[PDB]
From a paper:
To begin to address the structural basis for T cell mediated control of [name], we initiated a structural analysis of an immunodominant CD8+ T cell epitope QW9 (QASQEVKNW, p24gag residues 176–184) from [name]-1 bound to the restricting [name] class I molecule B*5801. This epitope is of particular interest because the conserved Gag protein forms the essential capsid of [name]-1, with mutations likely to impose a fitness cost. Here, we report the first crystal structures of [name]*5801, one of the most [name]-protective [name] molecules, loaded with QW9 and its natural variants QW9-S3T and QW9-E5D. All three structures are in a very similar crystal lattice and have two independent molecules in one asymmetric unit.
Note that in Fig. D and E, the densities of QW9-E5D-1 and QW9-S3T-1 are too weak to assign the long floppy side chain of K7. The side chain of QW9 residue E5 is fully buried inside the binding-groove, whereas residue S3 has its hydroxyl group semi-exposed. Comparing E5 in the structure of QW9wt/[name]*5801 with D5 in the structure of QW9-E5D/[name]*5801, they both form three hydrogen bonds in the binding groove. To sum up, we may have provided a structural rationale as to why the naturally occurring E5D and S3T mutations would not be expected to significantly alter presentation and recognition of epitope QW9 presented by [name]*5801.
Residue numbers in the entry:
A (entry chain A): 1 to 277
B (entry chain E): 1 to 9
C (entry chain B): 1 to 99
The structure:
Amino acid sequence: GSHSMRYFYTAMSRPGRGEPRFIAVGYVDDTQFVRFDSDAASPRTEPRAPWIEQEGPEYWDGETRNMKASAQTYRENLRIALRYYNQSEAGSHIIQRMYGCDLGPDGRLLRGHDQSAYDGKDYIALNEDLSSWTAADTAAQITQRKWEAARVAEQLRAYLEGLCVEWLRRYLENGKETLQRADPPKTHVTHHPISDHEATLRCWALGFYPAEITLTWQRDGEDQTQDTELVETRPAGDRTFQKWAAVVVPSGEEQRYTCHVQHEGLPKPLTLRWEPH
Amino acid sequence: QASQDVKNW
Amino acid sequence: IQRTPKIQVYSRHPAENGKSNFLNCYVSGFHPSDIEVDLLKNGERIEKVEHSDLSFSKDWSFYLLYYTEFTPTEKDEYACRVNHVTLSQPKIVKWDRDM
């Protein structure tokens, strides 16, 4: 239903080990489709999903030229940040940027995003109006003024409302088999004794796409959020995801506990119980 | 398709 | 400034002894991006280990997946070793097929 495209840039200075390294990856929803590494032999934007390979030589050459220029822009940005923060040339620092567009269920732009960070902290963000900026600190206000003066936001708004939505819609169509056909989780409950008087019930969801999912444990139809251990959703490596939720149960009460799975690939939310063999 | 960086920090 | 990595070690599919599978070590929530990740078989480094392209979450913290093909057995012990600026010593997480 809802879809999004995002690009993630990481630029890191490496004093005494090499020139600054720049990495860019692009995602449609939870599927990576391009990458660029300034450290690779002969840096090029490379495909990372089958459906992007259909693009012509000018696409790959155009992306590669843009990424090379961006890597050079962020080299400069790292030097500029050293000024604003009065930092030495000896340490390694990181600039990050993430930007892209969100489409609502109708396939039209729902929201645009553009955020930058310095050393892991918010630096500057384009506001939801796509016309003004939010600076996290006084250094970022220096950048904010330069970007207002150079009409940066108008150019980014044009990209986010235009080419971003326009290329995302094209990628979704070209990759509809995998991008628009959700995989429901395969689910089961496992039981692990802790002692003769207690056990862990673990609710598993495997092989699902996209990554969004809800796993909850209920006791007598009551939710047990405080007593549920949730691991973060993790990639299986084949473009699907995994998650589990666990609860510690007194022996003899196992059948009062139900696991509830909500995932867009499922017609109705599943309800599961320990089904001992 | 990626945006083109417009301007410096 | 510095965030220590979370670590999960797991197989792509439910492990069955003697059946070919993939061993995964997923490291996430860490900052800065420099990190050491190794997959171990019986405490020794597994040769051909591949990893995903560096990306990050909404909160700016990085994540990476390291993986290799493997066949689980009764005898062999598998683990993931992670070193980061936040850690004084490499922390080793053993593979538990129940997780």
